[PDB]
Amino acid sequence: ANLKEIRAKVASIKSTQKITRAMQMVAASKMRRAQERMAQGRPYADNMRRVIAHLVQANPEYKHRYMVDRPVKRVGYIIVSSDRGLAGGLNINLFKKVVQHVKAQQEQSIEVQFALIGQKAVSFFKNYGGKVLGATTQIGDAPSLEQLTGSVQVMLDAFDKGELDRIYLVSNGFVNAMTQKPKVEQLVPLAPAEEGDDLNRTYGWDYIYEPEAEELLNGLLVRYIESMVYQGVIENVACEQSARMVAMKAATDNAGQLIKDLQLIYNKLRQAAITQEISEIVGGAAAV
Template sequence: MPGIKEIRTKIKSVQNTRKITKAMEMVAASKMRKAQERMRAGRPYATKVREVAAHLMQAHPDYRHPYTVEPGSLRAVGIVVVSTDKGLCGGLNTNIMRLVLARMREFEHKGVKVQVTALGSKSAGLLSRVNANLVSQEVQLGDAPNLERLIGAVKVQIDAFVDGKVDAVYLATNRFVNTMKQDPSFIRLLPLPSVLADPFQTEVVASEDEQNVVKSTFGWDYLYEPDARTVIDELLMRYVEGLVYQAVAENMASEQSARMVAMKAASDNAKKVIGDLQLVYNKTRQAAITKEISEIVGGAAAV
């Protein structure tokens, strides 16, 4: 049985750890509210761009944007992986990376080449360790997504798709459901489907070919200035940028929520460990006192 001094030292150590986890829980709770507000604030813009883009794509069928051209077969694909820069957020990064690695194995099993882009230190580190074909990365994203930094890394994949080097580009991120639940999602970024839907507010379907597709009809007639090609090109680029931005915003909201829950669980576990150690400490102290009294009584009887 450990001595009283060792138990007291261990109790003090766990108490110090609990102070840290409690402070991290409070910080994550504060950042979580801001991240959720930022995520929800970006949805109206993304929704409107998506609606207008879907209308234009159906209203002007004689022009096919390169982003909407379906490949004949998959020979190479690109994957953009969104993760966190820091840990201590439960299984958030583990779940998304497990999904990405499983999809990479599926593609490689079919003879499809895979190149990846990492947004976040955790995905960049793991993809480097597994010797993946990492063509671009952006780390230290901060607490708020910066589109100028994000689009630089993602543009490598977009340019590869336009040049025909890859036949499809996928986006892997955590979809924020609520504070207690974050779902890893694997959605197709390019080519865009004929009808666009919000992958972060609708259920993600099992088939990759059916993702982002909803049944709807539009009867819009637009006047273009300067011309249809210029407007559609610019609008679809804004849509892709909005989807990437929203994916990172969703992941950041998921990160803070997962970290708050993980730190609360750690604080609760530390409290339980302290209680157990206090019980052991009291028993050990009581046993030591009883032993001393027995020795005193035995010595007095001997005299």
């Protein structure tokens, strides 16, 4: 209730509001950078999907196992989340959706395994428990694919033995600068759609490959999977910045409201103190 306490509080809140506004501007600037990077490999994955469409077009008799579903079992969830806090509810919303969908398989009792990329993800998965076969941290704003090749490589190596059934990828979708959605998808099986390009006007002669097209797609397929997971993780990274701007702007507004209320209380206390001092002085001067 001391006047100096209120003064210190208002000064501290002013400084904090200024630095939070500066951080909001910083986050706004960082927002676009990743948007641009996405637009860079977006054609890549787009032309890559055009490639994979050509890849599936090849070896018409041969069939790869990636296009079938074994008895649904051994579900594997890959989680990408922030390494730092203050991302709004994005982390908690994604994790809540993760655990709720985990009940799904848990409902028909499908064994659940998970891999993580985020630091908050590793903290949450350690607090919950279980055993994690792949954990990474400190990936970076623009991580090289090698930084993440190990997790997907070991996961695919594990699936190559047939132990796993399929991997259920998790990440966030950035709709606009103010709207994100925690999204869960499936990646291991692939089905072409609207890829009729080069099909209505395909060359009459058969595309004969000097290299063996029997295995040429294999590396491209693994190339396809690493490209898509890199695109997903970079999209999540870009979306992560989009939450911080609104978080800090809301924090600044709340700080403004609080400082207004504190100013009201401060004025009331100051007037009361002045009145009390004047009354005491007059009363004492009457005594003498």
